[PDB]
Design an enzyme around this catalytic site. Structure first.
Site, short mmCIF file in Angstrom:
data_model
loop_
_atom_site.label_atom_id
_atom_site.label_comp_id
_atom_site.label_asym_id
_atom_site.label_seq_id
_atom_site.Cartn_x
_atom_site.Cartn_y
_atom_site.Cartn_z
N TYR A 26 -11.82 2.07 2.95
CA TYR A 26 -10.89 2.96 3.39
C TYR A 26 -10.21 3.19 1.92
O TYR A 26 -9.94 5.15 1.96
CB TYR A 26 -9.62 2.46 3.74
CG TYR A 26 -8.75 3.19 4.02
CD1 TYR A 26 -8.48 3.78 5.74
CD2 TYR A 26 -6.93 2.83 3.97
CE1 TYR A 26 -7.25 4.41 5.41
CE2 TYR A 26 -5.98 4.44 4.11
CZ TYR A 26 -6.23 4.62 4.91
OH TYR A 26 -5.08 5.92 5.06
N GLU A 31 -5.34 7.27 -0.81
CA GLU A 31 -5.71 6.15 -0.23
C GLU A 31 -6.78 4.76 -1.66
O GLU A 31 -5.85 3.85 -1.30
CB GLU A 31 -6.55 6.42 0.83
CG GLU A 31 -6.40 7.16 1.85
CD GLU A 31 -4.58 6.85 2.38
OE1 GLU A 31 -4.05 7.97 2.83
OE2 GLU A 31 -4.00 5.98 1.99
N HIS A 62 0.73 -1.59 0.13
CA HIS A 62 -0.19 0.15 0.21
C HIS A 62 1.19 1.20 -0.03
O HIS A 62 0.39 2.24 -0.90
CB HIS A 62 -1.05 0.30 1.41
CG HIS A 62 -1.76 1.34 1.25
ND1 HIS A 62 -2.54 1.53 1.13
CD2 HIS A 62 -1.11 2.51 1.63
CE1 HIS A 62 -3.24 2.45 0.93
NE2 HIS A 62 -1.89 3.63 2.02
N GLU A 63 1.69 1.06 0.27
CA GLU A 63 3.08 2.20 1.01
C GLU A 63 3.27 2.86 -0.27
O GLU A 63 4.25 4.18 -0.40
CB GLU A 63 4.30 2.20 2.53
CG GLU A 63 3.13 1.58 3.55
CD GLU A 63 2.10 3.33 3.97
OE1 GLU A 63 0.63 1.99 4.79
OE2 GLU A 63 1.71 3.99 3.22
N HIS A 102 1.74 4.66 -3.13
CA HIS A 102 1.88 6.26 -2.55
C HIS A 102 3.44 6.69 -3.33
O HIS A 102 3.36 7.41 -4.52
CB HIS A 102 1.97 6.25 -1.26
CG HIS A 102 0.88 6.19 -0.27
ND1 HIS A 102 0.13 7.31 -1.08
CD2 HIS A 102 0.53 5.62 0.46
CE1 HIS A 102 -1.27 6.36 -0.36
NE2 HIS A 102 -1.20 5.83 1.63
C1 LIG Z 1 -5.78 0.11 4.29
C2 LIG Z 1 -4.45 0.82 4.77
C3 LIG Z 1 -4.23 1.33 6.33
C4 LIG Z 1 -3.37 1.54 6.86
S1 LIG Z 1 -3.63 2.69 7.45
O1 LIG Z 1 -1.91 3.20 8.76
O2 LIG Z 1 -4.04 2.31 8.28
N1 LIG Z 1 -4.02 4.12 7.05
C5 LIG Z 1 -2.35 5.01 6.62
C6 LIG Z 1 -2.75 6.58 7.13
C7 LIG Z 1 -2.14 5.48 5.65
O3 LIG Z 1 -2.98 5.01 4.34
N2 LIG Z 1 -0.54 5.49 5.53
O4 LIG Z 1 -0.36 5.66 4.70
C8 LIG Z 1 -2.15 1.59 5.95
C9 LIG Z 1 -2.09 0.55 5.13
C10 LIG Z 1 -2.55 0.01 4.61
F1 LIG Z 1 -2.82 -0.35 3.49
ZN LIG Z 2 -2.03 5.27 2.59
#
Ligand SMILES: Cc1cc(S(=O)(=O)N[C@H](C)C(=O)NO)ccc1F
Ligand SMILES: [Zn+2]
Length: 503
Positions: A455, A462, A413-414, A417
């Site tokens: 989310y 996101e 996920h990160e 970004h």
């Molecule tokens: C769904 C998901 C949520 C989160 S989280 O830590 O709850 N959300 C935080 C603010 C986030 O998106 N950081 O990049 C982190 C990774 C993920 F894949």
């Molecule tokens: Zn994020």
């Protein structure tokens, strides 16, 4: 004998106990019983519009607060709603802009004075600018004074004659494995598989705060499934605490000697036998580990050997797992994402002096965040985080992200970004932005933004990250759901990946 042991230890620290000043006692009491925020005063300080806002807000929907900040706001919400009607109270998704910004500034005023908590949150780095300056200085004065009080070691006579004990909640070490450690069918049993995952990479432990241990093992409460049995070293400093307890010095190392499943009163618990070592011994193992994983992955990514990419910011009780889990996380990252995309983006991060920060302290206390985030109300604690200003990925071991199966899903996920960043950079290197701020993807988000995870509905950034996550899931069904439920997003991400690779 339980009581003789208690007495023998109490007498050992008896002159110490008698020698304590009125300031020393109050300080030791303050440590065990943290000073909670005054709810009345906080509520009183809110405006009429802010009260209504706090009254109706869905607190669990936030993604930047801690579990403890959420818990308090829940209680604060209760006192607000009390004056209402019975029928109205029975009646009473991501947060609105108005709601979110309010909670962000409100978290500054709900911080308890908890010396042990501050130490654990910062991993000892108490100068970290994640709290008010004046409070930060009060913490420093208190901690220094407490360090001074704890000057008497356990002794060379007692250290190998006694075991000290600590009951611990499984969620303290890891929320992820804690959700499924207890057998779901039978609450009295431990899941043998999860127990293996927990036991495998737990070889050492660090305590950055003052451990409060039992001279005699007490039966565990229902939330407590971890039964630590601790042997101290002769020069381990401590102090006697009333009702048969010991306060240990901060910054100690703990070698995990054995992890077993035991039965206490017809119920299964985890026995963790630990031996106190010099913390520096542990830190060396950590630093050597960081040197190693960087060498393995610099070669794997075609980066220079002297490249500092992966950072171990480890200071807490599930230490070794944070280190070892990093290998498993990056392996999955390499497996589920094409090599060219990984190399191209990672090189972009390295060019910006970026880091992969694996840590067990809260993310506001990571330099890769707070150096670019002076405002505390903008500081975020969460499972993971990407900081474009530092080109860094932050991953918090102990916690659990929303609807994730593992840490590796969080890291991807990160990385999403970072992809969002690099792609926006390639489009316009002169004025760098994120591709998710392009009018095209914004329209795509306006249409398909609700078709994936809940989310993902938060914002375009996101959403992109969640879509990217699911597009590279080990589960083939998840990869197809994106293609079928958000086809525009699917192609949009694929276009960026090609454009990045062909750059
Ligand atoms: C769904 C998901 C949520 C989160 S989280 O830590 O709850 N959300 C935080 C603010 C986030 O998106 N950081 O990049 C982190 C990774 C993920 F894949
Ligand atoms: Zn994020």
């Amino acid at each position: 004998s339980r009581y003789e042991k208690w007495e023998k230890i109490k007498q050992h620290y008896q002159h110490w106990s008698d020698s304590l000043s009125e300031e020393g006692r109050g300080l030791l009491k303050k440590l065990q019983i943290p000073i909670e925020p005054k709810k009345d005063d906080i509520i009183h300080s809110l405006s009429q519009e802010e009260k209504e806002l706090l009254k109706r807000i869905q607190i669990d929907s936030s993604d930047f607060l801690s579990t403890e900040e959420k818990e308090f706001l829940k209680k604060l919400q209760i006192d607000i709603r009390d004056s209402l009607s019975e029928e109205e109270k029975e009646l009473l998704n991501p947060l609105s802009e108005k709601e979110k910004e309010f909670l962000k500034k409100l978290k500054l005023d709900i911080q308890p004075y908890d010396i042990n908590q501050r130490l654990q949150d910062t991993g000892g780095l108490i100068d970290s600018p994640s709290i008010n300056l004046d409070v930060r200085k009060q913490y420093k004065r208190d901690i220094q004074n407490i360090d001074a009080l704890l000057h008497q070691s356990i002794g060379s006579t007692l250290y190998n004659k006694i075991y000290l004990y600590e009951n611990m909640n499984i969620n303290n070490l890891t929320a992820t494995l804690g959700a499924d450690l207890v057998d779901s069918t039978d609450n009295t049993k431990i899941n043998r598989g999860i127990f293996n995952e927990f036991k495998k990479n737990f070889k050492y432990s660090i305590s950055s705060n003052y451990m409060i241990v039992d001279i005699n093992e007490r039966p565990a409460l229902d939330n407590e499934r971890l039964k630590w049995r601790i042997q101290l070293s002769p020069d381990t400093r401590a102090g006697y605490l009333e009702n048969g307890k010991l306060i240990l010095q901060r910054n100690i190392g703990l070698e995990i000697k054995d992890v077993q499943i035991i039965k206490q009163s017809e119920k299964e618990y985890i026995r963790i036998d630990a031996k106190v070592v010099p913390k520096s011994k542990i830190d060396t193992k950590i630093q050597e580990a960081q040197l190693n994983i960087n060498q393995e992955w610099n070669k794997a990514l075609g980066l220079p050997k002297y490249t500092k990419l992966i950072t171990f910011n480890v200071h807490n009780r599930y230490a070794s797992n944070i280190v070892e889990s990093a290998y498993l996380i990056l392996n999955e990252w390499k497996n589920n994402i094409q090599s060219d995309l990984i190399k191209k983006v990672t090189n972009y991060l390295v060019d910006g002096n970026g880091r992969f920060v694996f840590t067990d302290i809260t993310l506001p206390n990571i330099a890769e965040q707070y150096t670019h985030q002076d405002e505390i109300y903008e500081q975020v604690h969460s499972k993971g985080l990407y900081v474009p200003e530092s080109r860094s990925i932050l991953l918090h071991g102990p916690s659990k992200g929303v609807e994730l199966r593992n840490d590796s899903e969080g890291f991807i996920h990160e990385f999403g970004h970072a992809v969002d960043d690099y792609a926006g950079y390639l489009l316009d290197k002169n004025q760098s932005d994120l591709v998710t701020n392009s009018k095209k993807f914004i329209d795509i988000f306006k249409e398909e933004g609700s078709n994936l995870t809940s989310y993902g509905r938060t914002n375009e950034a996101e959403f992109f990250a969640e879509a990217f996550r699911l597009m590279h899931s080990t589960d083939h069904a998840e990869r197809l759901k994106v293609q079928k439920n958000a086809p525009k997003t699917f192609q949009f991400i694929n276009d960026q990946i090609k454009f990045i690779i062909n750059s």
